[PDB]
Ligand binder design. Structure first.
Ligand SMILES: *[C@@H](C(=O)N(CCC(N)=O)NC(=O)[C@H](Cc1ccccc1)NC(=O)[C@H](CC(C)C)NC(=O)OCc1ccccc1)[C@H](O)C(=O)OCC
Ligand SMILES: *[C@@H](C(=O)N(CCC(N)=O)NC(=O)[C@H](Cc1ccccc1)NC(=O)[C@H](CC(C)C)NC(=O)OCc1ccccc1)[C@H](O)C(=O)OCC
Lengths: 299, 299
């Protein structure tokens, strides 16, 4: 009984619109009287390579942007750019605008994604920002403009807007200020993602989730120093854990009574001597897409 | 009595060499039997724009790399690339190699820079990784290959190698695995740095340094919520403070007896109603290049 769960998506659902320029349609986010969407809505087929966006934008009329909420057009009366996003000023304030913030997320942090085509929601899934600033999503042509978010009590924190699919089939996007996560750019030029690594802080959190859920077999038989843990773990392509991360595990260490370095030690033995044929929470493989915050949430 | 201080530079001084290819000479770092240096040592004048480094490297002989420690050549017997760095295998193990680690640093963290020309040290200064992944250094033509570092007890943590000067006169570089900090690339093409912001976590730390040093006038007359602090501060181009940062100030909050949100409140009033004609630690301006760790260190 421990599962990836998404946030309920209803509050974000009533912000989703479609935005069409020419023959190209993608998703936008409608909040108050603004629609946010990827500025590549404005590109034609023959210049996705080196689009001059500010030149393409300045020659475009308000009327060229067809914005629809369901069957209902929303007249665009302003447009401007914000980094890699467009802000379109519309007709009408979204009567469904929830309480919201725009947040820029850190590598390792998880959010829910509401996957959309043609302004309509298809599904919600939970994922993470990877150490290499990509995300492992599930997105098809037309997904661009889909948003990632977290929700606390009554406030939607928007953190992600989908822009690109990499050659390896992972994904890249921006915050809601239009700023890319990672060294990526919105044009179809040859780029390169960093080698990815395992989110160590998250794998520990999920080992704490296991203990809380009653799973104890892998508890540590040997001791470790922070440094000695890092020397082994890096070899398995795990992120270095810093003292800042150690400090992040304090509350789960306090609630379980397992010192953070004792769990670091369990993790080392797991990697080395392993489950080999064993499971933790019913899982082969060490799960690295739950934060300390998610564990505390769902437990 | 509170000053920017650099780490003593002696341990890093005996790692500094010069590396010359053709007519181009820069600095390298000699540890054990490897010299690390920026791979742009290999570029000629007419292709700094789009250097094909792996092609330029593969056609280069070991002998083309002239490496000198003082007056003394060190024969290069291997070369390879690692991201934006070269690793040259040499003759001789540095008898002056200290205890060391390679660390990748976070925005906001400070290190000392040992500025070098032609393998010789000229000066040391303390600085920070900016939220926009540049550094505000003092570097002239030939500085490339200079290193940033921290030292704890007896171990040198290398974090930075200098590569580029931006149009605005700030600076860009890599970790010691050759990976750029920030979305920058080592070629003289048109690029762009993010708008920079003030390191909030650091300005608070420096207000704690003030209290410890006996400066109390600006202590808060009104209260604040984390959120309400952020709403004001962002307006002054300060980074958002997260709960993770709040947690980082715990020990200085414990040692001074000033709750972190009380200091957040002081900072808000300072920004709004201000020192206007007043000083804190003898400073006009709020200093944002000391970490919580530096304050605790020098206090
Ligand atoms: C928009 C859309 O749905 N998506 C995502 C589709 C998906 N499977 O996730 N976005 C795109 O398809 C991008 C459109 C675009 C963006 C900017 C400028 C021009 C066009 N294009 C890509 O994602 C493209 C996919 C190709 C199959 C390669 N990505 C790249 O070029 O990768 C660059 C790169 C990154 C890192 C390493 C190497 C290379 C829908 O396509 C749409 O409406 O487009 C309007 C133009
Ligand atoms: C190496 C050297 O000393 N420095 C730094 C000098 C300093 N003042 O800090 N490095 C360079 O000069 C870079 C050399 C280089 C790097 C890669 C490929 C080719 C050459 N060049 C630059 O720093 C250059 C400076 C020009 C005056 C603009 N920078 C850029 O091109 O900026 C790119 C950019 C970034 C962000 C926004 C916009 C643009 C010494 O120069 C040497 O030995 O060179 C060997 C080639």
């Amino acid at each position: 009984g421990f599962r990836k769960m998404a946030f309920p998506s209803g509050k974000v659902e009533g912000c989703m619109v479609q935005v069409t320029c020419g023959t190209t349609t993608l998703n936008g986010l409608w909040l108050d009287d603004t629609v946010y969407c990827p500025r590549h809505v404005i590109c034609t087929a023959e210049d996705m390579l080196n689009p001059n966006y500010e030149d393409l934008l300045i020659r475009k009329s308000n009327h060229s942007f067809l914005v629809q909420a369901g069957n209902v057009q929303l007249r665009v009366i302003g447009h401007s750019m914000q980094n890699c996003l467009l802000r379109l000023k519309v007709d009408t304030s979204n009567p469904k605008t929830p309480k919201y913030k725009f947040v820029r997320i850190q590598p390792g942090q998880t959010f829910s994604v509401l996957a959309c085509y043609n302004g309509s929601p298809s599904g919600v899934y939970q994922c993470a920002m990877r150490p290499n600033h990509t995300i492992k999503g599930s997105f098809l042509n037309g997904s661009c403009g889909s948003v990632g978010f977290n929700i606390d009590y009554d406030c939607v924190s928007f953190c992600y807007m989908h822009h690109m699919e990499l050659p390896t089939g992972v994904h890249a996007g921006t915050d809601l200020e239009g700023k890319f996560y990672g060294p990526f750019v919105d044009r179809q030029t040859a780029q390169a993602a960093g080698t990815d690594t395992t989110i160590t802080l998250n794998v520990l959190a999920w080992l704490y989730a296991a203990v809380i859920n009653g799973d104890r077999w892998f508890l540590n038989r040997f001791t470790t120093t922070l440094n000695d843990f890092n020397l082994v773990a890096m070899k398995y392509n795990y992120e270095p854990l810093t003292q800042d991360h150690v400090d992040i595990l304090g509350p789960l260490s306090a609630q379980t009574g397992i010192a953070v370095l004792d769990m670091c030690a369990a993790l080392k033995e797991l990697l080395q001597n392993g489950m080999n044929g064993r499971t933790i929470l019913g899982s082969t493989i060490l799960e690295d897409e739950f934060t300390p915050f998610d564990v505390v949430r769902q437990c």
